[PDB]
Structures are given as structure tokens and as C-alpha cells.
Symmetry: D2
Subunit: 381 residues, 4 copies
Amino acid sequence: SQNVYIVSTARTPIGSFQGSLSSKTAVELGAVALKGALAKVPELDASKDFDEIIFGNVLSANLGQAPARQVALAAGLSNHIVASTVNKVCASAMKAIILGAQSIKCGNADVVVAGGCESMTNAPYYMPAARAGAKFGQTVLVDGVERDGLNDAYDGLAMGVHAEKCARDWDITREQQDNFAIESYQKSQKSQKEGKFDNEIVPVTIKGFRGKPDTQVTKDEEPARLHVEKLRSASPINDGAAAVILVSEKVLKEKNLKPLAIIKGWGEAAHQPADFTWAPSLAVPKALKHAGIEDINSVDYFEFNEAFSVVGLVNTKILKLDPSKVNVYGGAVALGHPLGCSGARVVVTLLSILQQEGGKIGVAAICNGGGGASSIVIEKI
Amino acid sequence: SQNVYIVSTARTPIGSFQGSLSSKTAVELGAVALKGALAKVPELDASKDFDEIIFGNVLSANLGQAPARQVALAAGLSNHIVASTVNKVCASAMKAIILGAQSIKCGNADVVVAGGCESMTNAPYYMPAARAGAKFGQTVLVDGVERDGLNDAYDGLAMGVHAEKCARDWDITREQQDNFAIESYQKSQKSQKEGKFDNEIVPVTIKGFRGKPDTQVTKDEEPARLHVEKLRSASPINDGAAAVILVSEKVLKEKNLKPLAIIKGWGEAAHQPADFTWAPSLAVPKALKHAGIEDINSVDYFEFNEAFSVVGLVNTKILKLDPSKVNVYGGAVALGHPLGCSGARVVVTLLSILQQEGGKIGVAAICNGGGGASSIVIEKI
Amino acid sequence: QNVYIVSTARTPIGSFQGSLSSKTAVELGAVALKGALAKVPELDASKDFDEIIFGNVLSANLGQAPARQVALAAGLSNHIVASTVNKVCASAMKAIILGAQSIKCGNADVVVAGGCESMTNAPYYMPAARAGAKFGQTVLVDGVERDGLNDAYDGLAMGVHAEKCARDWDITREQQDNFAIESYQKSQKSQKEGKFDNEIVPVTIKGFRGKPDTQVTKDEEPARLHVEKLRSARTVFQKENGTVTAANASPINDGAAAVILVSEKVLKEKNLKPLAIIKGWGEAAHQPADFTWAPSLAVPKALKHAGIEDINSVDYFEFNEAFSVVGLVNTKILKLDPSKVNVYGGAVALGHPLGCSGARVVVTLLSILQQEGGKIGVAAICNGGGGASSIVIEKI
Amino acid sequence: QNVYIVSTARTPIGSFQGSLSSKTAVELGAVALKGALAKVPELDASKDFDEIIFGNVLSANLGQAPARQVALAAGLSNHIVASTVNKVCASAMKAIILGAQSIKCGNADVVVAGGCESMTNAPYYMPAARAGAKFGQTVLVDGVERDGLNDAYDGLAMGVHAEKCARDWDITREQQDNFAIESYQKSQKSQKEGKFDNEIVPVTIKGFRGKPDTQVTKDEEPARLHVEKLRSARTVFQKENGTVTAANASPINDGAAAVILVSEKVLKEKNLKPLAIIKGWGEAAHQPADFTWAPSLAVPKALKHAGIEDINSVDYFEFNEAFSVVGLVNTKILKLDPSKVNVYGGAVALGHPLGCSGARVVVTLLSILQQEGGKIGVAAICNGGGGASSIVIEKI
């Protein structure tokens, strides 16, 4: 019923599993990203202007009460903010943006923080038998990353296993997937070298360990660790956070803010849990229809999360897209996939692409475990 | 921008900690409640008519990928449904209803399942040191119920401790709180005896243990376990689930459904984390304003979750409410408080009160850990 | 140089998660030891006890030096030389043998021997905790299984090897069940007639929150016999064509036992009446899987060591009944009169607290010699790993 | 009846989470034992070994009967009588004493004694796992602390009691540091000159994923000495006015040691050359907190038992240096020539694998007598709980 504008975005670097962000919690990473975003829009006062935060997170175990609430308060936002945490597995942070946009369109909020955070490193092990007792015989300690993040709830198989099934189903070879993975790494490394992520990234302070000096994590860790022979001769596990600030048109005028983009529309779809990898081919058309884009060729750039090579290959094929418009800075296969964050990360990167590569209309898409996908259409100002 | 109707509601009985629902997971309880609700509206086809599920859950550890998704699929809903899980601590299930209503008002869905589920019994223990190793010296196994459910994230104190602080702050004595608790138990027991919960409750099948016969859990477990002397001479830990079905006016006409109530409005507010108990006094006025209710005396019944006695006492006082209109079937202090469920449970019970006690306008409210509260106004048909 | 048993005592044997679940292995050890000390006041706790050697298998979470703790908790002088020994099921018998050897060499004049075990309060282990699990599921190991009940070489339970033994010596389910029933019935009769009353010292259980203290005074397992359910019980170790079940095998149990040994010198100086003389002992081992009939090798060695050249001169036999097959095989191999063997019942009916049973059988044997008019007695116990220990005693 | 040491061997001592982290306690035991067996081929593994008594403190997750596993993994006959003994730090010395007693009584003619320990691979325990935690946080206990390093009565670390000892006998931080430095420097010199080469048998470490196998050939701790950092190291057990630190205390370590004992009879029949004679031994104990100077009580008893009436007739002393204070106090109390004590260094510099150290000091002592031209030697080791063990050997 009314226009929703992105006025600021930021994200942390993406850390490797047990890597450079191991000492940070998911909430701490969330606060860093959000503080990075708030700094760019000082016209919005932290103590009064922010009505709501909706934040993505998948592995909430041991984060404490209300992760989104903690993120807001740690970032210096007023405790009057309405906070909620949302989980749509991989799509969590995208769903947060969509829910934020809906909230603005309904007139129930004027300024919304959306985004997400995840520390897959610091997701704990669970002991299901601890409370009632094991009684006799061995019992299992469950890895929370696997159980709640990476494995399908219905067959127990890892997302990478389902990505392989999808490749077989669409007659995409192992070699094709490897080629694409390698190509994606090289695009990610090149985009890094050329400073393409510099505007979106805010660094993370790492406390020096008992006399060691403090330092900063400034860049995505995963791209430099490509090993071609190993790849040819599955789960990307990562840590990170991303944040975006959404405002109504009204607020944009009263506070004299520069809009970065307008949320034209969004679409969500789902089908068989095992077929999640090509669920974006269902969500994208719904989003384009919602945005009033009749022709798919009017879109300038596409960013899929593309955590697996098959996701990039299949969805481009099904949608009949020009591959030169798709994931021009690389994808999650190379950059990493912090589950609760990635959904907003693709939107952050998409917006950077539109600004830096001279695009006007962009669509972001992300598939999620459970069989779903989410998609958003934005137009640069 | 358009009317949202409740067409069906249901809930499980509320189990005691390590009690009658110990053998059920949060997802299984969710499916029971949702199947209970679907059965009442056969005009809506499970295979085609449901666009979205938004489901509350706080303790997601060891539930598997995407609890809301699992609930939908276990209840027999089509895998085309758009699923997301939301956490607003105690208010989770209320927030789900609000997000569902917003989704309908925006024209992005026509039929939404909202509600929530929780098994505090089967929330696991965590081992934070398991992944990287403990190295040397003792390490702690964390109770997930405490860490993510009951304890405040900022000071680490249980919700009951903050309820006591609130009582001191508003000069409400220990004896007053005990009186109210006891009174609430007796109202809950009486409402149970008179069959007041019979229409909303659907039973839970319990599998008989190796030759023992299967049975059904049909009633709320907590009310019968009142011990007055013990009370006079803190955390209510419970298991359960609740579901509500929301539709647009359009759908209500095309499918020839009987509306039970209309969602007139809602309001959310927050302040200091330690003061969560009287956050409903901020949320209720916002909800009434959103619903266009100028006078608070036009409301016929109030249902607060009222997990602690102080919540009932303080908020009634601050809002200057007629105590005979407030929590006439009792409250969570007596019935129990399954965190991710209670937010929808109060709406379910409120609607039952309006139908059975001859009310037209009702407001439900629920405070949550982190300092927030959510509120909804409904009008019976 | 003669070694005399001067006093014995044991706790009641508690069931798994049963009547002694609130007590640690050390606490049970102290009860048994104090029970034994009380019967010989001539020996002063603060001066006369040179050494303690105490059996225990599951030492995890007991704290530093279980035997030492048992001695000090029982009020013995901190000058006592303390050591803990583990020979699995035969631990406590090995403790007596090592105590005898110590007296024999003149190193000690008064030795406390025995054993204790709380299989209930044995903890779970996390092998991956120290270095980290990194990724993927990891296991919490049950200490009872890993260090007590499972073979170290193939990882199979003692019951699986009891089944192998049943097959190799063609002992049927029927035979085992009848032996089990017999063991229960004898155990119940002995309890009824007070045959364990001299042996047993009660365990005080603390009443929590203001309820009065309660007393555990008898063995918990014998009362559970249900003959019909026993005969139709499922085969637990082998699904198809099995013979061993939960009811014809020894259960998991808690308890302790203690015996006081003295030299001939001390016997005369303190004017103590000796209950028995340690005539000899024998230990043997072979294949781990064949532990069930290792006592048939150990017994002959003990008799030879004692100077008994005809096996029929011994009046009573106490074989630890870890399984019904153990009682049946060793009686058959040694070609013994079954009426001389385990006359008060055995571990199938009374329970099997691993670290304790080795001394428990000696404690009971001595009572049998005193009460049933026997002079010569042999105790024998098999142990996981393929071994067995045996001791010959003569009543004075 | 004479008891002769006929062969000795030990593994290198690995650091905590260090060079032997991939090996279990049993595996290290087998290496040491096989090292010892190799030096006496006249003794056949399949027939001549009657008994094994092996020291081990942290038995959790080792599997049934650690000593038995060590024997069988080393290729000994499954007819061997096996038992595991625990006397905390003195376990392995107690194993030798019990082996000697066994030979002396004629029960055995050839005994394997020694000990093994992997403090690295000792697991964490979960006491609440079996019955359930119910509600609220629960603790995962470090087995190293609970059963190895902490006193059972007050729960304080051995280092806290070492501080008490420093205060009670007025031994300064400076004195301890200088003793520590001295121990490191001697240890390094001995390593340089190959003084441990006869003793030590190397441990093969499996190379994972196609990398070649590697070899651990020397003790890991001695190379870590940094004198300046040692002198300014923080006091770990006592914050204010502390004396004991990480660098002047023994570390946490992995390793194993083995000695082969025979009767005079076997010595002549198999035509073995004896390395030493067990002249005697002595054990004593007192207050748990005073364990550090318990060796000063044990040593006199051993000398009396051996028939040595003047302490100056002994050529070399091996005291286990659990802490720098232990070396200093016991030398002062016994009024010994410090140049006769721990001439190759000690546990502060070499490491202290609890279940192994008791035999390790005997192994090293014997090497000292052979290489430094000594005849009479005494080894002594204190243990948690307030005890100490001591043994007197004479080179042949």
C-alpha cells in the first residue's frame, strides 16, 4: 500500500568454520553489522527513530533470550524497539526483510531493521538424554549444526546430498558442478581484489588473547582457500551477519534521507523438501509478478545465494537467464553460507552490484532447507 | 487494508514439566493442535488452500530443520506452503498471528496458519565446550530451558526474580501475589470442571510403553496440582501447542466459511528488560488505538497470559480495569506457560470466553522476556 | 607363616538404581569395613592396621585413591598403607591374596582386604570432550559397559561370551533357568532363616527434607523371583536360539565387603580368636572369551597350593554365579557334588557388584563353614579378560 | 628368597596433548613392555611369564583390565595372571613391590611389573548422565583433576599442598626455582650425553592420510626450559605470596615403564644375567596434606628392611620430583648429600605420568647405578592421599 526504501546496508566479513570469527557470538556479529548500517544514516536517531527489528537466525541454541532483541540493544538502539527473531533456515534473513517491508506497508512501523546473523562455529552440541537420564548404555551427543542447520528433517540427509540428487535429476554432471564451483571461486577472489565488497563490509574487532594484540577481520575468509585438486579428486559452514534499514516514504521525506533502492516486490514458494535447490525457479516468477515486471529480461542483475554449484546451474537454466547477468561477484559456494545471515547478504551484495556495475533492477533469491525459496526485487535510485 | 477473520482455533492440553506430554516433541504437539483446527474447517482443502504458516517456538534446539515447516507437513498440509518459525520469547505465538494478519492485509496470502508450540521438557542440555574442546578443568553443561527460555540475557536472572522486583516496584506484597495465585488456581479448576476449555482442547495420543495400552491426554495438568501451604510457606515450565486459522474476507465468501471473529487490531511495545511484567500496559493502549477503540470500557473481556501473579495485579491497576472482566477462566500461573505456544493460547481462550460468556470485544495480551509485550483486539461475530 | 581371617562383614547387595543408589562405592566400603572392625575391638583402629588392599573396578569419579578413602572414612589411622586393585570381577579376591602374601613376607601383621562397587553411580564418559568433537555426532560412553561388562578385545558383553560357553559345553536354556530358579529359592530360604545375619551390616540411608532415616538390611534381588516370567523371559544377548536372559544372568549391583587378616604373631599378642586359616590360593587364565570356565583351572592350582590332593576332602564350594552357565560348567568340569556348591545361593539371585564379589564369596563361604558344619572351603570367581581366582580356607 | 631385576624399559615421556597424544595408556604400556621383553629373549613370551602387576591411576575408558590388555598387546601368553594396581603416583612402584612379594612367596617365578598413563586421553565424566540432571546446569568433571591431581578430602590440587609444605618448612620461591632450573639443566645434559638411551624405547606414531610414520625417541619436557620466564612465572596455586608455579612443578604427562622380575631359581635355569637385586622396600603414610615429605618416613623403613643401617652407604637417590619442594624437603629432612640425588634430573623437568612414574624412577635409578658406578640405590615416590613408597636396589 506504500513504498519501502532501503536507506542503509552493511555486513561483516564471512568467517570460515572454526576460523577468523570463532571468538564472536552470533549476537555480537549481528551488533557489528547493525552498528555498521546505523553509522551511514545519522539522520535516524538510535534513541527514538527505530520502531522494529526482525532478525534472521537458525541456530539459536545458547544465544540467550531473544537474539534479535540482544542485537538491537547491543547496537545501541532504544529498548522501545519491537524485536522478533525469524527462522526460515537459509532464507531467514530474506524473510526478515519481507516481514519488515510488510510491516511498513501496513502502517504499523515507519523504520525497520532487518537482516540476520549466524555463528555455525559456536552452535553447541546437544545432549537429548541429559535431562531424564541415559539409564544404561551409550547415548549420542548431537551436533546442532547438523541437526538444526544442515540436515533435512524428513530423511536426515545433508543439504549437499540433496544438491547431488538435484544434479542427477536435471542431468548436470559432476564435472559441470566442479567447473562452476571453481569459476565461482575465481570470480569471488577477483571481486575481492578489485574492492567490490569494500563498501558493504564493516570489520570485526578480535580481542587479542592475553598479551597478544587486538586485530580486525576485514575480508571474507573462504575465497582464498580454494583447492582445485581436492575438489575434483560438501556443506559450507560459516559465520557472519548482515543488516539492512528499511523506511517508509514519509520518513524518507521528513528526515531527508537518501534512498539507495526501493523494494519493488517479493515472492516465496516451496515444494518437495529434497528439491529445495530449484525452488528459486518458483519464487522468482512470483516476485516479478508482485513487482509488476512482465518481462524477465528487464532485470539487469540476479543474485542467487548459490551455496551449491547446482543451484546456480539449474535455476539459470530453468529461468532461461543470461548467465552474464547472474552472480557476477561469485556466490556462497566460494564466499561461504552463514545460514541465518545469507538471505540479507544476497540483497546487500545485489545492491552493491546495481550501484557499482550500473544496474537499475535487481532480483535476489535464496533457496532453503525444507523445500522453500524466497525472492526479492529491488530498484536502485 | 482489508478484514482478517479467525475461522478456526484449537490447542493441546498443557502438560506439566516432565509430565503427561513428556513423550511428545514440540513439533508433534504443533501437528496435533493444527490438525485439530483444520478438522473444523473442511471447506478449506489441505492440499490447495493454505498459503502460509507462521509458527511460534522459543526452544528450537534438537527440533530439526524448520519447526513450522515440519508442523505443517506433519499435519497433512501441502508442501507448497510458505513456512517460517518466529521467536519473541513468551509472545512468539501472538507475534505469529500478527505477522499472519499483516500478510493477509498486504494481499500476499489469503489463508494463513498461525500459532505456536513448545516442549520445555524435551529442550536439551547444551555443551558449549564440546566442539573446540574443554582442554583442562571442569566445564559446564547448560540447561537450554534456563539459558534461552527463562533467564534474562542481560543480567542472567530468572523471569520469576524479575516478577518479584516488579512487585516491589509497584508496592504489591507477597501475600497479595499469593492470594491472586491461589484465586487463579481455583478459577482454573472451576472452569475445567464446568467444561469451559472443552471446545478449544484437542487431546494428545500417548503411545503405550511396550505392552502398556495407548492413552489420551485430554486435560490441562497444572491446575489440579495446587499446593497452598507450599506456595505460602517460581518458573512454570510446561509443554503444549496452539493453532489458529486466518482468512481474508474474499476467501471467507468464496469458500462459504463461518467467521468466528475479526481481528480488529494489535499493538506491540517494549521498554527495560527487567520491567517486562508491566509492558502489557503499554501494548494494550496501542492495540486499542489501532483497532479504533477510543474507550477502554467498551472491551468486554481481557485475557492476559499472566504467567506470574504480579502481571495480573499490576497491569489491571495501571490500565484501571474492572477485575471481573479480566482472566475469568484463570491464567498461566495456574494453567501453565509453554513459551512458544502461550501467545496464541490466550487468543484461543479469549475467543472461547467471548463465545461462552456473551462478549463481543476482547483483548488478549502477553508480556515477554527481553522487556516486551504484544496485544491483539478481536471482535466476535 | 600362617594367615588368619579374624573378622568379616559385608553390606547388603543393592539393585541397579536401587536401595543403595544414594551411596558412593567409598561410602559402602566404609560401612562394610566398620562392620568388620566392630567385631574385633582388640585391634585398635588408630595403631594396629598396617595395610589396606581394596578391590574396585569402576574407579571413575571416586576421587584419589578409593582404598585410602575407605580406610580413612572407616576411622582407620592415616598411617595405613593403602592401595586399590583391579582384576575386574576377581578384584576383591585378589586383594585378599595380595594381603595374605604381604603378611606371609612379614611386611605387615594386620591387613584389611576386601572390595567395593557402585555400578549405579559409575559415570558416563565423554572421550571427545578434552580435544573437541569438531564436527558430527560423538558418543557418551557408559562406564559400566566400557570398563566393567564388555570384553576389551571384541567389545561384546560378558553375556555374549556366556552364550558361547553354553553352546560349547551344550548347556540348554532349560538347564540354566532351573539353575537360576534353584539359586533364587536357596537365596530366599537363607534370607528367611537368617543365614546372612552375621555377615551383613546395614546401610543407613539419609531421609531427605525431614523424613526419618531408613535402613537397608537385606539383599534386594532375591525377592524379585517370578518363576513363570523367568521361564518365558526373552533372550537378551542372542536373539535367535538364545539361552542366557536377564533372569538367569547376574544383574548389575552395588555393595561392599571386608575381611581382616592377621599373622600368627598378632593372633597371640592381642589374644584374638581366629575364624579361619588361609590354606592356599590359585590363579589362572586363558582365552578371554572362555572366562566362564577359567575357575576349573584356578581351583586345582589352589588345592595343590593348600596341600589338598583329593578334591572330595573339601566340604563346601562358593563359585561366583556371574551367569547360570558359570555355575553349571565349572561343577561339571570339576565333577563336583552339586549339593556342596553355593548352598546359600549365588550372584544370579544375590547380585554381582564387580569390585566386591571376590571378597563377598569368601565372606559367605566362611559363614557356610561356621553354620553348616564344614571345615574346608574353596571360593572361586571368574573375571572378564579370561581369568579366575580361587582361595582355600579352613575353619578354626 | 632373592628377587632380581633382569630387564627394564620405558617410553619417552610425552607432554600434555603432545607427542604421545595419539596413543592410549595401554598402547604405551605395550611399547614399554615389549622394549623390556626384547632384552631378555631367553624368557619366552608364550610360556615363562607367570604374572603381570601394572600401575595405572586414570583407568576410565581404557576398557576391561588395563594390565591384562598391556600383557596381551605385548604378545604375552593369555595364561598370564594380570592385575591393575592404583596407589596414585606410587602405583607403579607398588606394582614392583607386589611383584617382589609374589616371587618371594613362591607363587610366581617371573613377574612383569611397571605402569602406564595417558593423562592426555583421560576422559571427562558426566556424573548426572545416568539418572538425569532434571533442571539447571550440571558439570562435566575432568578425570585428571578428580581422580589424579586433586585431594579427595578437601578437593584442592597437589600444588596447593606443595605450597603448604613450602610454608611449613620455609622453602622460598627462589630456592624452588633454582632447584627447578638445576633439574632442567641436568636433564638436558643427560639427554645430550645419551644417558637415557639404554632405558628408552621409541614410540611409533602413525602418519595419517599417506604421510610417513614418525618416531618419538626422547622426553619432550626438558627442551622447554627458558630461565628468565621461569624466574618471572606467575604463581598458579596461590595468588598472593606464592612459591609454586607451572615451571617449578611437575607437568601433566603421558608414558609407561616396565621391569622384569625373576626368582633366583629362574635366573640359573634360563642362564640370565641379573642387573640388580631388590634388597628391600618401605611404605608409609600420614596426613594427606603432608604427602610431599612422606618419602622421608618411607625411606628409613626401606633401608631397615634391606639391612642398611647407615644411610651414607647408599650411592644414589631417585626421588620423584612431583614439585621442586618435594626434592628440597626430603633431602633436607633425611640430611642427604644433594649431589647424590636425582643426578640425571627429575619429574619437574622430565614429566610426571602418574601411573608410570613409580617404575620410571626405578628404571632411571638402575641406569644411574650402571653408568655412574654406583652399587646401592634407593628410589622413593610420594603419592596423593598422604603416602609414599620406597625401594632399595643393589647392582649386580
